[PDB]
Amino acid sequence: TIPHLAIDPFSLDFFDDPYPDQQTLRDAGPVVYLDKWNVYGVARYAEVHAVLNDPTTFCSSRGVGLSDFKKEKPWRPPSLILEADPPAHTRPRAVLSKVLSPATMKTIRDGFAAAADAKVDELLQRGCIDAIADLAEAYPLSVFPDAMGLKQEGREHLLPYAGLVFNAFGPPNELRQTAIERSAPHQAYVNEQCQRPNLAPGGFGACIHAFTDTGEITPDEAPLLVRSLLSAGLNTTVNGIGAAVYCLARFPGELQRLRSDPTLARNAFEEAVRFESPVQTFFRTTTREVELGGAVIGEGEKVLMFLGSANRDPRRWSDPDLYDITRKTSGHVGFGSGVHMCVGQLVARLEGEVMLSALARKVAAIDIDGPVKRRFNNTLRGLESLPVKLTPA
Ligand code: HEM
Ligand SMILES: CSc1ccc(C(=O)O)cc1
Numbered sequence: 001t002i003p004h005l006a007i008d009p010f011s012l013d014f015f016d017d018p019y020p021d022q023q024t025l026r027d028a029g030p031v032v033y034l035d036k037w038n039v040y041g042v043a044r045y046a047e048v049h050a051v052l053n054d055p056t057t058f059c060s061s062r063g064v065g066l067s068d069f070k071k072e073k074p075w076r077p078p079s080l081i082l083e084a085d086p087p088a089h090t091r092p093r094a095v096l097s098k099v100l101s102p103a104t105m106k107t108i109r110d111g112f113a114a115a116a117d118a119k120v121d122e123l124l125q126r127g128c129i130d131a132i133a134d135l136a137e138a139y140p141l142s143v144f145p146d147a148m149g150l151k152q153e154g155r156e157h158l159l160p161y162a163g164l165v166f167n168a169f170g171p172p173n174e175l176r177q178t179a180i181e182r183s184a185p186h187q188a189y190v191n192e193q194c195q196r197p198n199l200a201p202g203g204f205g206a207c208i209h210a211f212t213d214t215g216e217i218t219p220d221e222a223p224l225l226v227r228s229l230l231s232a233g234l235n236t237t238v239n240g241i242g243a244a245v246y247c248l249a250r251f252p253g254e255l256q257r258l259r260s261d262p263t264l265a266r267n268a269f270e271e272a273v274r275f276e277s278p279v280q281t282f283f284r285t286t287t288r289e290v291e292l293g294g295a296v297i298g299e300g301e302k303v304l305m306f307l308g309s310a311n312r313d314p315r316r317w318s319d320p321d322l323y324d325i326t327r328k329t330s331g332h333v334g335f336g337s338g339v340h341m342c343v344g345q346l347v348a349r350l351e352g353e354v355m356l357s358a359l360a361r362k363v364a365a366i367d368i369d370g371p372v373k374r375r376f377n378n379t380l381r382g383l384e385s386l387p388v389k390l391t392p393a
């Protein structure tokens with residue numbers, strides 16, 4: 001009853017161009033079985049949305065990667081938020097919500113925006129730049145570690161550590177196994193910066209530790225919640241901003257609309273998140289036998305959600321393969337949906353908005369002028385190198 005496919009969604013060929021195989025996965029049926037990894041797959045918007053919004057049946061505490069924590073030991077202590085179910089999830093989630101809340105966004109917005117404007121002014125002096133290293137990476141590195149409260153020394157560990165985290169959600173392929181082989185120094189640095197004395201006053205990390213006396217979290221939970229932000233909040237934004245720049249470079253008509261109304265910056269970024277989906281795939285594990293899209297899934301089965309595919313499903317979106325900065329993007333699953341929906345989404349949107357605003361006001365054209373190189377990761381989509389010429393407005 002369930003179609004069985006041999007598509008490997010963690011293969012280099014799939015990463016290089018996932019869109020045809022994602023259509024094959026959607027069109028095969030609402031629920032597929034992936035024989036390569038012995039998991040169920042859902043690639044349509046409807047089933048991805050349903051799975052995300054039934055956390056009792058499709059749990060996270062057995063891992064959101066391929067590995068089932070009931071069968072294998074996790075590669076690092078489980079996240080207290082991502083890898084927890086209600087009720088254990090609820091209070092750590094509330095703490096991170098308040099740490100990354102509107103009031104916090106108000107305190108950091110002016111500095112984030114000034115840093116975005118400054119970076120674009122600097123890039124315009126060079127003209128020809130790499131929109132990954134020099135923009136998508138450089139900008140978040142200039143604001144997020146400081147907003148966390150991290151010291152200057154050792155920040156070179158942050159991107160490798162986060163890359164490791166996202167490779168580790170994948171199956172035990174060469175990408176995952178090489179990442180884990182190289183992890184020790186990055187884990188050591190990251191774990192150390194999570195301790196209270198190492199986080200500067202007023203930053204996100206200090207705020208997490210300050211919440212350890214309200215009865216929501218205890219002091220011993222705070223380091224792992226700082227670890228969550230370092231794991232989840234840097235390389236995702238890098239790829240989101242890189243995706244937005246790539247879209248503007250490939251769809252010049254939309255750059256022109258954005259220049260004509262810079263208030264479209266926030267939605268231009270949201271549309272880039274839908275269109276490229278930096279976080280491509282995530283898993284759940286069934287806690288009972290369940291009927292989903294007409295199929296019967298047994299207990300203890302891994303279910304792979306194709307977030308990027310759901311964000312391009314023509315059953316849900318008109319012209320899903322077009323980048324449209326005025327699209328009604330509400331409901332896309334690029335940040336998830338339901339109780340785990342990205343707790344850092346306001347930080348991501350602030351960074352993307354102020355960078356796209358700076359581009360909208362300062363740049364007249366973005367022209368690819370060199371070889372584009374993709375970066376391969378088991379669950380993140382994004383580029384390694386994006387040579388562009390920026391023409392000033
Ligand atoms: C464009 C940038 C980002 C994207 C595409 C993204 C994507 C996602 C997605 C899809 C989830 C849901 C995971 C699931 O349902 O299992 C999530 C959760 C989460 N995100 Fe983000 N994220 C981004 C930025 C950030 C930032 C900036 C932070 C922190 C500053 C952050 C921290 C987290 C955390 C801690 C969770 C777990 C929330 C929970 O389990 O309740 N993310 N993110
Ligand atoms: C959705 S990506 C991500 C989210 C949370 C964590 C974490 O809690 O460590 C890591 C990655």
Ligand SMILES: [Cl-]
Nearest residue numbers: 076077187190
């Ligand atoms: Cl770790």
